[PDB]
Structure 1
């Protein structure tokens, strides 16, 4: 049998400074219990007496038997001084109801409502329901209300009366995901260098969880952190991952990971540690190139070099070539390890057929690739003779090796023909792909 109370009312009213007196009749009576806001008192007299009521005595009074069953009365203290009772703390989960702890000490008052500080009208879509026993409650708290400033207001004698001033604060719901970005995307290092990568996480709240883990390995790395709050609902974190002396085994994938109750985001960086630096070299043309005298040729190498190449030079016949050669990284990316070099030989002479060498070095390695240039020439005839046998010779020179024909009516090859003719004109006519030259001689009888 849940316990029974004298006086008999659900709500009861006393003037300030005037006695309060409650009796609970149960043979199983245990306890009397009084609540308002966070204040709670527990008492085991059969009757509760307070000969000097105060506004703070406003609250709820609840009586319990050993059956474990309870009956309550709610008690209100008229006090012209303090019409409200407050706890300033006011926090809201975004999209949850939030309660504004301003319960009234008199229930017999009108237009219990909520009003902005400094005259400002509350946001149009804010809407609320009042309860004199609890406070006023705000439906579906949304981010605009953050540090919204509130008063609770009540009318007495036609005069309009306000509580001490309240600030709502709002604790985000997550409705999107963390945003995560990494300072450099791929890394290459000499063994023994220090490795430092920084990862940046942005979210509406610092309850984002973020980590650095190494893929296909579950162990937590060691990390240093920096955080900023960049005004309302704007939080940024930076996380730094360091290996102070990088081993080759360190090579692999590092993942920067960041989950919130909406869901995870990840971004990875890849690391190569190498024991010593390299220079690979890739010629872009064949290593043997052919040019006609006074035409133009380019020699082009592309090469991969780490650490960054320190000298790069072009030499001809053991003399260092200058101001004919231009070199550029293939891509401007931070991860490019790659370079292109060119030598432009313009209006080449037959005399500079020969060998052209490219030499490049970084701190660990020196590498060279060599080119051979054959400058084609139109043939010439350079000797002609008429000889005691009745027999004839001519000598022709050039590259590719020329050809010599007879008619009647590194560097230059050398080629010769003989024929005996024993009235008119004998010719040597001399040709290769490049050009043709011809020489003539005559002999007579009388």
Structure 2
């Protein structure tokens, strides 16, 4: 740590006096203090000297010496009072700005340390300090208001008790600022919207401070909407309410944007214009083929406006009409309807229709569920010619076995091709085996 001579906490001098501050370290050192006139500076390798021949009131303040290049070295300080008459105070600044819950130093320097026992902080026009003002005093620095609040943004004065009369410093304006984190908090709702050729869009922004803008813009052309403004829960609100009692020219990209001294913030939504609609679709093919015993989920996606007034699943399957209930749904303008068909039994094959209805009409999507066919074999002797059949979808082959010998028969002469049946094939002991992507079959005569 550097060493200051004289080894005294403070000095008190008259205007015109000569003051010489000397600092010494191991490495180079440098002085910092009040920006003041008539200071001469002498410096070499290890020491540095401040000196003046005409000391003035502006020279009043703390002079701190540090040794750069020594890290964590620390500093040494000394306070200079230049008691310019009559004049107990040397105010360094008439304006101070801080944020809430910070200490606020009011830099009125006392020109005579013995006065400290009789000093106080007041407001202009003799008014008293605001209620619950936490503050303390240091002769070298001035009054510090601890954990400053917005309410304490006032014009202050330093009081010194001299010969009974309290003598005031010049006024000092304190600015306490609310800690404003960022741009105004936006709330644009609804995030999604779609109507037939009423709707409502409310752009809102809120900050602890009033000084902030907010605008709602259609596309990049801002709309002229009168904003409702109110103060609640210690926060300012500013709400732009758009009412469309609608058409195709109103649809588009509504951006809600608010700005302040911090910066600009933006949020947005999309507005679509369709009359009432109801569109049904599936990621799945309507023609379904699954093996018996397998589970299947039939899913339909429904984009509808206004809300659906009814929906169901119906078994048109030929097998006895046990009706779904089975049916579940997730997502409100979008919906997915899922009919669960676990461990499919053979009577569950057939047609399943999903129907949905709203003010726009009704729509249906019908699935056709065929269960796997396994190769089924029929061999007859006719006139010297044997005739085998083998059966299933998809289209099978045939493996003949004399069991000695084998003939194989991949895509035979076709017996039945018609939609929604088995794909029939005809082949002209004789073991006649059948294999498709479905399975193994055989017969012996």
> What is the TM-score normalised by the length of structure 2?
0.55
Shift in Å, 1:221: 1.7
Q: 1-side partners of 2:140 and 2:219: how far apart?
A: 50
User: Residue 346 of structure 1: which of 335, 342, 348 is its match?
Assistant: 342
Aligned to 1:179: 184
Are 2:357 and 1:361 aligned?
Answer: yes
Number of residues of Structure 1 aligned to a counterpart in Structure 2: 310
Shift in Å, 1:188: 0.7
**Structure 1 runs not aligned, ≥5 long:** 1-90, 100-109, 130-137, 330-335, 419-424, 442-446
Provide, for residues 102-144 of structure 1, a one-character-per-residue CA deviation record: whole Å limited to 9, x for no partner. xxxxxxxx96752575896634589999xxxxxxxx9999953
Shift in Å, 1:170: 5.0
User: Residue 439 of structure 1: which of 424, 439, 443 is its match?
Assistant: 443
User: Residue 114 of structure 1: which of 103, 121, 128 is its match?
Assistant: 121
Are 2:247 and 1:247 aligned?
Answer: yes
Q: 2-side partners of 1:358 and 1:170: how far apart?
A: 69
Aligned to 1:221: 225
Aligned runs of 1:272-287 on 2, under 5 Å? 272-287=271-286
Q: 2-side partners of 1:121 and 1:140: how far apart?
A: 6
Shift in Å, 1:202: 0.5
| Shift in CA distance, 309/352, structure 1 to aligned 2, threshold 3 Å | same
| Shift in CA distance, 212/174, structure 1 to aligned 2, threshold 3 Å | farther
| Shift in CA distance, 393/197, structure 1 to aligned 2, threshold 3 Å | same
Shift in Å, 1:340: 2.5
Provide, for residues 124-170 of structure 1, a one-character-per-residue CA deviation record: whole Å limited to 9, x for no partner. 589999xxxxxxxx99999537348978756476x57799xx9x985
Per the alignment, in what secondary structure is the counterpart of residue 149 of structure 2? helix
| Shift in CA distance, 154/123, structure 1 to aligned 2, threshold 3 Å | closer
8 Å Cα contact 1:185-1:268 kept in structure 2: no
Provide, for residues 276-331 of structure 1, a one-character-per-residue CA deviation record: whole Å limited to 9, x for no partner. 343444422333332223333332333433334443432232657414232212xx
8 Å Cα contact 1:183-1:197 kept in structure 2: yes
Are 2:267 and 1:265 aligned?
Answer: no
8 Å Cα contact 2:135-2:144 kept in structure 1: no
Stretch deviating more after TM superposition (317-326 or 264-273) = 317-326
| Shift in CA distance, 372/263, structure 1 to aligned 2, threshold 3 Å | same
Aligned to 1:413: 423
Q: 2-side partners of 1:151 and 1:349: how far apart?
A: 93
> What is the TM-score normalised by the length of structure 1?
0.55
Shift in Å, 1:181: 1.0
Aligned to 1:206: 210
8 Å Cα contact 2:205-2:239 kept in structure 1: yes
Q: 1-side partners of 2:339 and 2:324: how far apart?
A: 10
Provide, for residues 167-204 of structure 1, a one-character-per-residue CA deviation record: whole Å limited to 9, x for no partner. x985748976532311426231424723031412213x
- Structure 1 or 2, whichever has the larger Rg, is 1
Aligned to 1:299: 298
**Structure 2 runs not aligned, ≥5 long:** 1-93, 107-116, 123-127, 404-419
Per the alignment, in what secondary structure is the counterpart of residue 335 of structure 2? strand
User: Residue 194 of structure 1: which of 184, 199, 202 is its match?
Assistant: 199
Aligned to 1:428: 432
Stretch deviating more after TM superposition (177-186 or 112-121) = 112-121
| Shift in CA distance, 397/169, structure 1 to aligned 2, threshold 3 Å | same
Q: CA RMSD in A?
A: 4.6
Shift in Å, 1:254: 3.4
Per the alignment, in what secondary structure is the counterpart of residue 146 of structure 1? helix
8 Å Cα contact 1:381-1:437 kept in structure 2: yes
